[PDB]
Write a protein that binds this DNA or RNA. Sequence first.
DNA 1: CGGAGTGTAGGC
DNA 2: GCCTACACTCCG
Lengths: 68, 68
Amino acid sequence: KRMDCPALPPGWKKEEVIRKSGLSAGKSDVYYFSPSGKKFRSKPQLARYLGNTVDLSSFDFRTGKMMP
Amino acid sequence: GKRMDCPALPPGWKKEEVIRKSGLSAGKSDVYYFSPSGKKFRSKPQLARYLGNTVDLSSFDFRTGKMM
DNA sequence: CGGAGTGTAGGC
DNA sequence: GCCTACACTCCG
């Protein structure tokens, strides 16, 4: 599932992957992809990439949604 | 490279550490193991399978070659 | 040597 | 005790 993520700029996509095994079996990891395709696995990695082009203070990494 | 006797596995067992010379993981290493026959092992689950019940590798640290 | 998938420390 | 964030494995 490579989903657009409306609350980021155009081209940015979100993907949620189910862990198949280990002690976190059934938990999920959320990945984001830039228009170029670079993969991001956290909020600060995403903030380091984006800088002041986007405010991410209210941005929920898990859901891809801004939190009012 | 250098196979050095790994005193924590049965006798005849050699370890070898090989530095990655470039790319993103430049300067990390892969650790390899050799049986007496000289089969190369690249992981802890593969080493466990070859050995099964004959050796308890639960406390075995694959990277260092020591117990834990 | 890469990198998807899992381990796991530390903040909470 | 749970989650975030990123290190590390393992096998291609």
